[PDB]
Design a protein around this ligand. Structure first.
Ligand SMILES: *[C@@H]1O[C@H](CO)[C@@H](O)[C@H](O)[C@H]1NC(C)=O
Lengths: 51, 51
């Protein structure tokens, strides 16, 4: 809350580090855009049947 | 009989603060006097509001 807020420099670098990652996981292909939203994912379309 | 009351005016709000001061002048009384502390901020900003 101390005003004016001063951010640490490292933070931006950590952000870039996190956003640049591309890995394989339980959610499928994991990659992010500049805003942090998911990209290149796969959403399986499923139907409930008798079997 | 000084009454401390905080206030928050979004930057770019003028007539509101004007009518606020006019209200302070007209409704002023000998019994007690309100003592506002004005701080202008970005109303959409949650951090600013919290601070
Ligand atoms: C990966 O996802 C992004 C975001 O939708 C898309 O623009 C891009 O074409 C995708 N790449 C491939 C190879 O599907």
């Amino acid at each position: 809350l101390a005003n004016p807020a001063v951010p640490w420099g490292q933070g931006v670098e950590i952000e870039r580090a996190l956003k640049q990652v591309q890995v394989e996981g339980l959610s499928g292909n994991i990659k992010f855009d500049q805003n942090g939203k998911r990209i290149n994912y796969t959403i399986n379309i499923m139907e409930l049947k008798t079997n | 009989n000084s009454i401390q009351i905080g206030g928050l005016f979004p930057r770019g709000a003028d007539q509101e603060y004007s009518a606020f001061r006019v209200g302070m002048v007209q409704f002023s009384t000998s019994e007690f006097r309100l003592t506002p502390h004005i701080d202008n901020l970005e109303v959409a900003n949650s951090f600013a509001v919290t601070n």
